[PDB]
Amino acid sequence: VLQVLTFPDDRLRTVAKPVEQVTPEIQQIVDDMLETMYAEEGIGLAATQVDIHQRIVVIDISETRDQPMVLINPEIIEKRGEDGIEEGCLSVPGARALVPRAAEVTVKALDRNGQEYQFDADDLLAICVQHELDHLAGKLFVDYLSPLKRNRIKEKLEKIKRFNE
């Protein structure tokens, strides 16, 4: 029954806790998060973004939208090089900006079945991994921008929700 939190919500700054065991409940969070992500046409989503404060990320960067990746307790064990591309975020609707990142990452994680696995990534996946793990640390891509640009984005989003609740 998930919707995405939007900047400047303080719940987006919560540091996620490790998942302890991959239970059917965790599997259900995973499934729901993938449905949300596809419906919002995203290529990644962190649990923190739907107010679930546990280290779960889902990603699909494929143009055919059928190559899902599930990352439970992901950890970047090595970063190499520098790169960056234009990023957006379902939690920052309407904003896009170049973010400096590592070019390559080595990532360890559990899959949807609790199997630990390790992989290297570059290009869009490396970027999306970094972006999504930032969320689990309470960081948003607008944190890499200038204050004036970030403040404008914040003010525009606050306006949108000013009559809520």
| Catalytic sites, residue numbers | 132
Residues contacting Zn ion: total by CB under 5 A? 1
Instruction: Tell me: does residue 99 bind Zn ion (CB under 5 A).
Output: no
Q: Is 113 helix (H, G, I), strand (E, B) or coil?
A: coil
Q: Which stretch binds Zn ion (CB under 5 A): 66-74, 82-90, 112-120, 142-150?
A: 82-90
Classify residue 64 as exposed, middle or buried by CB count within 10 Å of its CB (0-12, 13-18, 19+): exposed
Residue matched to tokens 């302890």: 20
Q: How far is the CB of 21 from Zn ion (least distance, A)?
A: 26
Instruction: Check: CB of residue 75 under 8 Å from CB of residue 109.
Output: yes
User: 42 phi and psi, to 5 degrees?
Assistant: -95, 165
Instruction: Tell me: does residue 89 bind Zn ion (CB under 5 A).
Output: yes
Which lies closer to Zn ion via its Cβ, residue 116 or residue 124? 124
Instruction: Tell me: does residue 59 bind Zn ion (CB under 5 A).
Output: no
Residue matched to tokens 């055919």: 64
Q: Which stretch binds Zn ion (CB under 5 A): 12-20, 72-80, 86-94, 157-165?
A: 86-94
